Amino acid sequence: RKRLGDLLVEEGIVSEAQLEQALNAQKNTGRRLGDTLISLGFLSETQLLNFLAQQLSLPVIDLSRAHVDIDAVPLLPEVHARRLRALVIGRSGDTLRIAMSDPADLFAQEALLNQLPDYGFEFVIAPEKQLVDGFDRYY
Amino acid sequence: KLRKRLGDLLVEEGIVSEAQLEQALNAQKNTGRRLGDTLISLGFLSETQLLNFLAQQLSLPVIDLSRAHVDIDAVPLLPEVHARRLRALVIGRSGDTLRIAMSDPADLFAQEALLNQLPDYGFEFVIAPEKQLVDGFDRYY
Ligand SMILES: Nc1nc2c(ncn2[C@@H]2O[C@@H]3COP(=O)(O)O[C@H]4[C@@H](O)[C@H](n5cnc6c(=O)[nH]c(N)nc65)O[C@@H]4COP(=O)(O)O[C@H]3[C@H]2O)c(=O)[nH]1
Ligand SMILES: Nc1nc2c(ncn2[C@@H]2O[C@@H]3COP(=O)(O)O[C@H]4[C@@H](O)[C@H](n5cnc6c(=O)[nH]c(N)nc65)O[C@@H]4COP(=O)(O)O[C@H]3[C@H]2O)c(=O)[nH]1
């Protein structure tokens, strides 16, 4: 997979110098690169969501207007959903549609496999704020 | 799971050669040593290179902990004896999320321990050199 900074440069969203500044800043915080670029004023939140979706080849969703399957939600117990920042929003056959705010999180991906074994997975990316509101709404 | 396995990553990015990888895989068997450390022992890879490519493999950043922002109030959430055992330092807290620097974020045995030790906090992981972690323990406890 292409790295996010390189993607944003190739797409003309940030310059090489801006990317280097953010990478240097990140070495001193450990915050995510996209979040760092937003702090520096070089990237917007909407761009971050859209370009993450492009990097990972996942759809963006507006959960605030989505119609969530309320019988799919409980397949992932609340304690795990909140911890992993993941919400099961649909079930077709044995494929679950799962919204995540950090779908690039390797350890969350590993955990989800452990918590929801034997299902097919389709992922969509949502803003963390919408996920958090979703947990309150659907549990 | 699934990360790209480390050998293939290092070969594809032109860090180690195919024959060297095969040599290290052969040599690693039943030594108790992981692949990166085997490659380093054979002189094909450096500690810094291993750090940087583990970070790429695990999709996390390397930090310079000697200069990094550390919430010195967040540090004590993990008692010193556990921080030292697990080679893990809590450097940020916000809501129920902790940012944790580890020398080995691939250490799942340590991760399990960290999880049971800091329950009801979720984690964001970053990697730092072990020397910097230990200096951090001396500095923040
Ligand atoms: N939800 C969310 N996801 C985000 C954000 N920023 C980055 N990501 C996604 O999450 C992964 C980890 O980001 P990171 O912690 O900044 O960790 C990054 C970062 O430290 C660094 N990195 C990212 N892009 C570049 C680059 O163009 N050049 C270099 N040298 N390093 C890069 O390598 C690590 C892995 O990069 P990736 O493969 O791109 O993988 C990224 C990316 O897929 C964010 O603000 N929010
Ligand atoms: N802190 C630290 N972490 C390390 C080091 N070396 C590897 N790791 C990480 O820890 C996991 C286990 O390494 P392993 O015991 O060598 O066990 C490895 C190794 O025996 C083997 N492996 C790795 N790469 C290759 C490869 O390219 N070809 C083959 N045939 N086997 C491979 O598969 C197992 C799993 O590989 P991975 O998915 O890459 O998962 C690796 C990797 O993420 C190290 O020196 N220090």
Author numbering:
A (entry chain B): 7 to 145
B (entry chain A): 5 to 145
What does the paper say about this structure?
The VcMshEN structure was well-refined, and its macromolecular chain could be traced from residue Lys5 to Tyr145 without any interruption. Each MshEN structure could be further divided into two subdomains, a four-helix MshEN_N (α1−α4) and an α/β MshEN_C (a β1−β3 antiparallel β-sheet surrounded by three helices). C-di-GMP was bound mainly in the MshEN_N subdomain, with the only contribution from the MshEN_C subdomain coming from Asp108, which interacts with the amino group of the second guanine (Gua2) base of c-di-GMP. In VcMshEN, the N-terminal α1 helix is broken since the full α1 helix causes significant steric clash against c-di-GMP (cyan arrow). In addition, α2 helix in VcMshEN is extended by two turns and swings downward to enhance interaction with c-di-GMP (blue arrow). The first guanine base (Gua1) of c-di-GMP is stacked by the side chain atoms of Arg9 on one side, and by the hydrophobic residues Leu25, Leu29 and Leu39 on the other side, being sandwiched between the two hydrophobic surfaces. The backbone amide protons of the third Gly residue and the following non-conserved residue in the motif form two hydrogen bonds (H-bonds) with the O6 and N7 atoms of Gua1 via its Hoogsteen edge. Each of the two conserved Gln residues (Gln32 and Gln61) in the motif forms two H-bonds with the ribose 3'-OH and phosphate oxygen atom. Therefore the unique interactions of c-di-GMP with MshEN seem to be driven mainly by the three highly conserved hydrophobic Leu residues that form a triangular cluster to hold each guanine base via extensive CH-π bond interactions.
Recently, MshE (locus tag VC0405), an ATPase associated with the mannose-sensitive haemagglutinin type IV pilus (T4P) formation in Vibrio cholerae, as well as its homologue PA14_29490, an ATPase involved in the bacterial type II secretion system (T2SS) in Pseudomonas aeruginosa, were shown to be potent c-di-GMP-binding proteins. In both proteins, c-di-GMP binding has been localized to their N-terminal T2SSE_N (hereafter, MshEN) domains, whereas their C-terminal ATPase domains were shown to bind ATP but not c-di-GMP5. To explore the possibility that MshE contains a special kind of c-di-GMP-binding motif, we have solved the crystal structure of its MshEN domain (VcMshEN) in complex with c-di-GMP to a nearly-atomic level resolution of 1.37 Å. The structure revealed two 24-residue motifs linked together by 5 non-conserved residues that work cooperatively to form a 53-residue domain that binds a complete c-di-GMP molecule.
